[PDB]
């Protein structure tokens, strides 16, 4: 009996593409999805296959360092017995010279480009040789696939649809940008594969990386860190209406999410672009105007199980391709379970912010993060609001209970200490108390500006920024900022007031503490001693006063107001004394009333009771 000769193999692009939902990708080469049977037809030259005489065996390899242990290589015979969940081949039709075969991949097979080989054996003789190539993708249709999605219309939207909306604008003026993901355009699937093949984990361990491509968690994680360019390229580096041009040129803000979504839909992971809106003198705003806060922010959600985590975390996972991040279940964000991988705290901070006033302790609602979180409706041209998936309603026991799981008691006040006087330099303090068992690391803005009696803010006369302020558990701190006469004199108002403001930022949980306090730089005190009455005043300035003059009156003590000038200028710190004669009109209590006048220091007042 002569050995078999394959004339050709028919990859059945059409019936395969339609059944595997890869029609658009099956224009040239074969593309299929895991955990689902596909078809090949062998045409032999001469006699057909005879199960009794011929044993046929298949071999598939994927990647640059295949192995069986890693799941990136399989050998499997052509037989009637089909083992569920394994690589198998089985005859399903036999005609004149053709042999119809049905192949199955495991639902957890690594995705990627596969070389398919066939060894034809007639016991006493044999011959191996390559049939061709197919690409294996994730299968949201396969009940046993991690990325399974029980709903047909959701499968259409989150994998199959090539145009969507990305939401921009603002929480109150939501704008929907139409986008062309075009995950099934020419060359796109090949680029997604290349992208995978140049990610750092591939350069580090090609074999292991190709194996780990069985995981939608691994694959989504890798994609989040490849859209952006961190000196290693890297698709994007920080107008156009789709992902295709960007990706094609590559091979040679919302854009990151858009490209990520293109790639992940292409690889077969159901995915959606989501937008989060944030909204806003105030130290916070000042501080902003390296993670800041923007009017909106875009990331993606992918759908998968999470066997790598504890049970119950399957479903939507957040991934942020914004300048590796994720995947992290969306329910873990909503639940304040930030210990959950990957990168919980980072996503939590995109949708939470805890802002507290110490204006002396109240809730400051001048910053509001996490509003109208949005994504396109399934199979309709309208916006779905998914804020609820990230956040329990404000003020609920679930919202509060969740805040605790996340946060696992810190307070701030402005302190002065000793007395402050018009003309002197002196410290002000941000006094921070930490009666928790937690250790913190915060940013601190401490700054002062003059303010009128009416509340109008003059120019800055002191600033201290601290990028990393360490707060030990059960401890406190007095952080000094030194206010200089040299720096406030020129910019002082009729008010005589300085406004101290502090901002403490705890970046991880995204907490903010504001303390604010106005301080009054008091005028010198006029000393009035009765011997005749003597009145003196100490120059409080480091400068000399020119044209000093007193004025004294007090009915029951003088029938004449006595305005005496001071000839010489009074030097810094140098006191100035005058005296005038008094002839007590009547008997009881009288009040002497004094005014001091000067070029720099004007309108200072005093009095003394007598008898």
């Amino acid at each position: 009996a002569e050995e078999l000769v394959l004339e050709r193999c028919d990859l059945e692009l059409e019936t395969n593409g339609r059944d595997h939902h890869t029609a658009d990708l099956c224009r040239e080469k074969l593309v299929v999805r895991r955990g689902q049977p596909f078809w090949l037809t062998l045409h032999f030259e001469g006699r057909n296959y005879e199960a009794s005489v011929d044993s046929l065996t298949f071999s598939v390899v994927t990647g640059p360092a295949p192995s069986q242990e890693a799941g990136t290589k399989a050998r499997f015979p052509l037989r009637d017995a089909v083992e569920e969940g394994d690589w198998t081949a089985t005859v399903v039709d036999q005609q004149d010279c053709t042999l119809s075969l049905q192949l199955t991949t495991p639902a957890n097979a690594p995705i990627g480009l596969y070389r398919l080989s066939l060894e034809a054996s007639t016991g006493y003789q044999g011959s191996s040789f390559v049939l061709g190539h197919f690409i294996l993708l994730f299968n949201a249709w396969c009940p046993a696939d991690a990325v399974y999605l029980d709903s047909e219309e959701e499968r259409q939207e989150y994998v199959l649809t090539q145009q969507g909306f990305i939401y921009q604008g603002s929480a109150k003026f939501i704008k929907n940008i139409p986008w062309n993901f075009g995950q099934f355009e020419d060359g796109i699937l090949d680029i997604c594969l290349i992208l995978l093949d140049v990610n750092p984990k591939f350069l580090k361990n090609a074999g292991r990386d190709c194996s780990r491509r069985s995981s939608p968690v691994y694959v989504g994680r890798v994609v989040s860190g490849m859209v952006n360019c961190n000196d290693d390229q890297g698709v994007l580096l920080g107008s156009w209406i789709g992902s295709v041009d960007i990706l094609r040129r590559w091979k040679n803000c919302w854009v990151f999410a858009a490209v990520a979504c293109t790639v992940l839909r292409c690889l077969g992971i159901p995915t959606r672009v989501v937008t989060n809106y944030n909204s806003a003198s105030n130290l916070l705003i000042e501080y902003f105007r390296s993670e800041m806060i923007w009017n909106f922010h875009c990331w993606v959600e992918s759908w998968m199980t999470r066997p790598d985590l504890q049970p119950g975390y399957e479903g939507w996972q957040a991934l942020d391709p914004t300048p590796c991040c994720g995947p992290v279940p969306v329910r873990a964000i909503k639940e304040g379970d930030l210990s959950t991988k990957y990168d919980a705290p980072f996503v939590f901070a995109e949708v939470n912010a805890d802002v507290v006033d110490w204006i002396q302790k109240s809730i400051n609602r001048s910053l509001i993060v996490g509003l109208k979180i949005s994504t396109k409706s399934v199979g309709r041209d309208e916006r779905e609001d998914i804020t609820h998936t990230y956040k329990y309603p404000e003020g609920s026991s679930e919202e509060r209970e969740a805040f605790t799981r996340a946060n696992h008691g810190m307070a701030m006040r402005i302190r002065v200490g000793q007395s402050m006087n018009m003309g002197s330099d002196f410290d002000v303090f941000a006094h921070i108390t930490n009666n928790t068992a937690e250790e913190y690391v915060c940013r601190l803005l401490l700054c002062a500006r003059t303010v009128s009696y009416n509340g109008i803010l003059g120019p800055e006369c002191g600033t201290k920024y601290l990028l990393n302020l360490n707060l030990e558990p059960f401890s406190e701190k007095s952080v000094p900022l030194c206010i200089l006469y040299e720096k406030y004199r020129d910019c002082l108002t009729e008010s005589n007031l300085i406004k101290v403001r502090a901002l403490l930022v705890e970046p991880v949980i995204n907490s903010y503490l504001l303390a604010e306090r106005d301080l009054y730089l008091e005028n010198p005190e006029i000393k009035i001693r009765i011997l005749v009455a003597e009145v003196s005043l100490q120059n409080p300035l480091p400068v000399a006063l020119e044209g000093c003059t007193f004025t004294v009156e007090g009915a029951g003590l003088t029938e004449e107001q006595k305005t005496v000038e001071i000839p010489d200028p009074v030097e810094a710190g140098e006191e100035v004394k005058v005296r005038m004669d008094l002839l007590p009109l009547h008997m009881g209590l009288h009040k002497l009333v004094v005014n001091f006048e000067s070029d720099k220091l004007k309108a200072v007042k005093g009095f003394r009771n007598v008898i």
Partner: peptide, 4 residues
């Protein structure tokens, strides 16, 4: 996209 704009800083708050």
């Amino acid at each position: 996209a704009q800083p708050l």
